[PDB]
Design a protein around this ligand. Structure first.
Ligand SMILES: c1ccc(CN(Cc2ccccn2)Cc2cccc(-c3ccccn3)n2)nc1
Ligand SMILES: CCCCCCCCCCCCCCCC(=O)O
Ligand SMILES: CCCCCCCCCCCCCCCC(=O)O
Ligand SMILES: CCCCCCCCCCCCCCCC(=O)O
Ligand SMILES: CCCCCCCCCCCCCCCC(=O)O
Ligand SMILES: CCCCCCCCCCCCCCCC(=O)O
Ligand SMILES: CCCCCCCCCCCCCCCC(=O)O
Ligand SMILES: CCCCCCCCCCCCCCCC(=O)O
Ligand SMILES: [Cl-]
Ligand SMILES: [Cl-]
Ligand SMILES: [Cl-]
Ligand SMILES: [Cl-]
Ligand SMILES: [Cl-]
Ligand SMILES: [Cl-]
Ligand SMILES: [Cl-]
Ligand SMILES: [Cl-]
Ligand SMILES: [Cl-]
Ligand SMILES: [Cl-]
Ligand SMILES: [Cl-]
Ligand SMILES: [Cl-]
Ligand SMILES: [Cl-]
Ligand SMILES: [Cl-]
Ligand SMILES: [Cl-]
Ligand SMILES: [Cl-]
Ligand SMILES: [Fe+3]
Ligand SMILES: [Fe+3]
Ligand SMILES: [Fe+3]
Ligand SMILES: [Fe+3]
Ligand SMILES: [Fe+3]
Length: 584
């Protein structure tokens, strides 16, 4: 029906190197606790066998589906019963139940130590002696910690990491080049892991119609020179894709992804003209590239949306004829015109239209009833543009670090009850969001913000369901996609909070504060700022500036000083004592 040998088709399709790396990521995600060692033979054997099928597709065993091959290898591991336990009982089953059985014993978050990043001298020296082992061991370590991370995407990050190593490992200050590049693409790797978990939960926590409206909006921004009927074809295929990808089967998700890229690339002309570099790329990178394509230009003279949606007499019956399709046509016309909008803003608008149409298409004079609906959109539009305008001018006046401290005070007062490391991690993340996004002009600021906020805001919510501390954070995390952010933006100062018991040790500073990296230094300052607010919640902004002003003096005096360890302990007891009286 399909190819005679699946393994051969994919070996020639991918190439040996991509095949080897991808086979290893798959077994790494399924047998996370086995030594690096075991996987390298497993991949070698899988790769020896695949080559025999490239030579002869009618050779031994080459006609079994890759799924069969995959489980067959998993069950040859002899430690499977002792190390994986009930995961070995899946071998008692036959296909297709066996694969579906291995599928649900993938361990979302297993118990592995956090990888400690060795020094730049020792990384570069290791990358030289054995490039292969260095890069593949780290692929194994990351895949065993991220079992649901799409394998092709993990391979793309590994190739970027390799690029950093090949370039920065032959420089004068290797660390000056390597470290920012590993921080950038580790935060990127953490941000992409979060997008993947968010979308899958979004699928089911808000509904398919909410999801389907999301993708209608997004696809209309990306492809404005395309018909609503092409867009809604693509929305439907994409929902199939995401549904089997979130389910977890790598092969099933990758086939579905490739077929969609092949379709998109055949029907380029009716879709978008920004699409020729991705379609000349190999099968593996095709959908990767199409996923990240720039928005096509909007058709030049587009009419006002008020004809089809306000002034036409037929709106109320075209709507009631097929309510959702009409709302999706509203959504597509509004979106193709506004790639400067966040998707969720466009969903607020379509939902506001919708709420106005059920009210107004019951009236006698509906056109009279809804002639101010388009007026209604504009404060919805104004709200996020303005808190962006406001927060990017703050960032511009304070620089990243001082802006992050502004946010620390803001969110500690809003939600005092949160752990102080978490307050620091999130206010540090938001400041990086402002650094990334405020470098766009206004026309691209709102998509940027939603792109990064939605992962920060979801990582915050998965953390909260685990260790709950605030009902007002539970509220916002359980609301509709469209109300998630405006809920957070509406959190006010907890005026029911009781100040924290003052603890002396938490505001004393030893001699290490000088000998620390620029990062760690800031972290310990920010940790104390939080605990200062947690103890002085009704401190004013000016009082706080005095307390942090005198503190900053206190470090610069007892760090240029010939005796460090004793100016800190004495000029600090005075600071703690002066601060307690300045506040209160
Ligand atoms: C890792 C992380 C993020 C991305 C997203 N990519 C979109 C893109 C646009 C055109 C062609 C391929 N990828 C942007 C980008 C930046 C740097 C490298 C690559 C890349 C290189 C090879 C394969 C896949 N990606 N990609 N890719 C890999
Ligand atoms: C702590 C950083 C260690 C150095 C990086 C190792 C370079 C090769 C790694 C291959 C796969 C990398 C995928 C990382 C994604 C993530 O950070 O979640
Ligand atoms: C024992 C064999 C198991 C491994 C089988 C090889 C499968 C390689 C991974 C398939 C994805 C390749 C195409 C990517 C699809 C896409 O996202 O465009
Ligand atoms: C990783 C995105 C899905 C897989 C790629 C299949 C073909 C490209 C799809 C382009 C859609 C661009 C918008 C982002 C996807 C979304 O709406 O969630
Ligand atoms: C066939 C495409 C579907 C189009 C549906 C358009 C509906 C517009 C209303 C916006 C809904 C987004 C918010 C979801 C709220 C919810 O379902 O709880
Ligand atoms: C400008 C980004 C960094 C700012 C850090 C804290 C303030 C975040 C609020 C700004 C963006 C809000 C709009 C997001 C998308 C939407 O809800 O439509
Ligand atoms: C478990 C973690 C709890 C963290 C909750 C504290 C709130 C931190 C800030 C998140 C809201 C940011 C989005 C809107 C920005 C704004 O208007 O301030
Ligand atoms: C009740 C008061 C207790 C004593 C408080 C002592 C001072 C704590 C200061 C911690 C905030 C650090 C501010 C960093 C700003 C900067 O780097 O200039
Ligand atoms: Cl093919
Ligand atoms: Cl060399
Ligand atoms: Cl050499
Ligand atoms: Cl990092
Ligand atoms: Cl996650
Ligand atoms: Cl999403
Ligand atoms: Cl699989
Ligand atoms: Cl490229
Ligand atoms: Cl009229
Ligand atoms: Cl219609
Ligand atoms: Cl407009
Ligand atoms: Cl625009
Ligand atoms: Cl009118
Ligand atoms: Cl917490
Ligand atoms: Cl602006
Ligand atoms: Cl977070
Ligand atoms: Fe060499
Ligand atoms: Fe890429
Ligand atoms: Fe009129
Ligand atoms: Fe959001
Ligand atoms: Fe001490």
């Amino acid at each position: 029906d399909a190819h005679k040998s699946e393994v051969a088709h994919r070996f020639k399709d991918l190439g040996e190197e991509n095949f080897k790396a991808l086979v290893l990521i798959a077994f790494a995600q399924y047998l996370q606790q086995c030594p690096f060692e075991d996987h390298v033979k497993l991949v070698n054997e899988v790769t020896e066998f695949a080559k025999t099928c490239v030579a002869d597709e009618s050779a031994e065993n080459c006609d079994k589906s890759l799924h069969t091959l995959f489980g067959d290898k998993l069950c040859t591991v002899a430690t499977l019963r002792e190390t994986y336990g009930e995961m070995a009982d899946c071998c008692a089953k036959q296909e297709p139940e066996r694969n579906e059985c291995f599928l649900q014993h993938k361990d979302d978050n297993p118990n592995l130590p956090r990888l400690v990043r060795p020094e730049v001298d020792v990384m570069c020296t290791a990358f030289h002696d054995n490039e292969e082992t260095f890069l593949k061991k780290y692929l194994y370590e990351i895949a065993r910690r991220h079992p649901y991370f799409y394998a092709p995407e993990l391979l793309f990050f590994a190739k970027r990491y390799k690029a950093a190593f090949t370039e920065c490992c032959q420089a004068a200050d290797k660390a000056a080049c390597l470290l920012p590049k590993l921080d950038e693409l580790r935060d990127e790797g953490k941000a992409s892991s979060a997008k993947q978990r968010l979308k899958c939960a979004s699928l089911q926590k808000f509904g398919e119609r909410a999801f389907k409206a999301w993708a209608v909006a997004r696809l209309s921004q990306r492809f404005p020179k395309a018909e609503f009927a092409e867009v809604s074809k693509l929305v439907t295929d994409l929902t199939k894709v995401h549904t089997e990808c979130c389910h977890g089967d790598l092969l099933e998700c990758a086939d579905d992804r490739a077929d969609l890229a092949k379709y998109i690339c055949e029907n380029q002309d009716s879709i978008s003209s920004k699409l020729k570099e991705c379609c000349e790329k190999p099968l593996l990178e095709k959908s990767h590239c199409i996923a990240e394509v720039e928005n096509d230009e909007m058709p030049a003279d587009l009419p006002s949306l008020a004809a089809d949606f306000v002034e036409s007499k037929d709106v109320c019956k075209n709507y009631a004829e097929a309510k959702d399709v009409f709302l999706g046509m509203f959504l597509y016309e509004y979106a193709r015109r506004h790639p400067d909008y966040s998707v969720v803003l466009l969903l607020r608008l379509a939902k506001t239209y919708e709420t106005t149409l059920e009210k107004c298409c019951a009236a006698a004079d509906p056109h009279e009833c809804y002639a101010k609906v388009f007026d209604e959109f504009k404060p919805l539009v104004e709200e996020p543009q303005n808190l962006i305008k406001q927060n990017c001018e703050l960032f511009e006046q304070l620089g990243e670090y001082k802006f992050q401290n502004a946010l620390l005070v803001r969110y500690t007062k809003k939600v005092p009850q949160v752990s102080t490391p978490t307050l620091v991690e999130v206010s540090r993340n938001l400041g990086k969001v402002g650094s990334k996004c405020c470098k766009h002009p206004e026309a691209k600021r709102m998509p940027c913000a939603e792109d990064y906020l939605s992962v920060v805001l979801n990582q915050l919510c998965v953390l909260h369901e685990k260790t709950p501390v605030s009902d007002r954070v539970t509220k916002c995390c359980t609301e509709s996609l469209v109300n998630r952010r405006p809920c957070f933006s509406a959190l006010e100062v907890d005026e029911t909070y009781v100040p924290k018991e003052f603890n002396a040790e938490t505001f004393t500073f030893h001699a290490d504060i000088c000998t620390l990296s620029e990062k760690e230094r800031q972290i310990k300052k920010q940790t104390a700022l939080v605990e200062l607010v947690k103890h002085k919640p009704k401190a004013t902004k000016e009082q706080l500036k005095a307390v942090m002003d005198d503190f900053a003096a206190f470090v610069e005096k007892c760090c240029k000083a010939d005796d460090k360890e004793t100016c800190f302990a004495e000029e600090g007891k005075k600071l703690v004592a002066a601060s307690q009286a300045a506040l209160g």
